[PDB]
Amino acid sequence: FNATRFASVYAWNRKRISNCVADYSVLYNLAPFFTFKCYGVSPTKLND
Amino acid sequence: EVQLVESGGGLVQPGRSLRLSCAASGFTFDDYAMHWVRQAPGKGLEWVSGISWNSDSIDYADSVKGRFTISRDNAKNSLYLQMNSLRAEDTALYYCAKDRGYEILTPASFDYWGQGTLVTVSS
């Protein structure tokens, strides 16, 4: 998320995440991320 | 905690050329844009020039077009500013600031600064 530059949409970049504990409160409590709407899972439940 | 060390300052006669180097060590340098700015001894801050993360987009101030040239060496993590055809009104204190983003002309501004180096153009 703090990456200085992103790739173009046609050549979209993919990163794999595994073997770690994931805390989504870092993403949730920041104001700038206005568009945060999720499919198939309620965001509040991500923490568990 | 980032470091910005500047060198090359001194005193020269008008019409001569001098060379400035600014080295950074506290952050990743290959993806940040940098700028040179000016502070008069009795006036406020003024922007001078700027270079992107890579030497593609380059900008100079209007009053200094065609006289000063900026360079950047990513391998040793530094940038440089060659001053040519100096006049009596370029005896100010020059700061080497780093941009938040990667381009040159963006709403993003300078994040971290470094102590300025003093130059004098007189006899």
Partner: protein, 108 residues
């Protein structure tokens, strides 16, 4: 072009006061202004990037606000190390990164 004006130049207050400084623009810049603090003895530091976004690592005492043509910074506590010169910079108009005049701050 663009012209930035500092309505106050020198302001006096105490350690337990609240101070405000305003910066006005010639035309609208769409909240694209930054506030810089410059100590006379060391390298200047940024206080606010964007209209009202607080930079990390600085005390929350400083508060920026305003949009359009005028902008404002406020200090609520005035800690005794808040003596410096404050600048407002625009990054939206064709003149690249033009700075306004200084704003001296003294405590008395």
């Amino acid at each position: 072009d663009i012209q930035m004006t500092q309505s106050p130049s020198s302001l006096s207050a105490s350690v337990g006061d609240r101070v405000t400084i305003t910066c006005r623009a010639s035309q609208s810049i769409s909240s694209y202004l930054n506030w810089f603090q410059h100590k006379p003895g060391k390298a200047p530091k940024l206080l606010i990037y964007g209209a009202s976004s607080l930079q990390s690592g600085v005390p929350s005492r400083f508060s920026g606000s305003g949009s359009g043509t005028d902008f404002t910074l406020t200090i609520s506590s005035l800690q005794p190390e808040d003596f410096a010169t404050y600048y407002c910079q625009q990054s939206y108009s064709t003149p690249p990164y033009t700075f306004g005049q200084g704003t001296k701050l003294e405590i008395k």
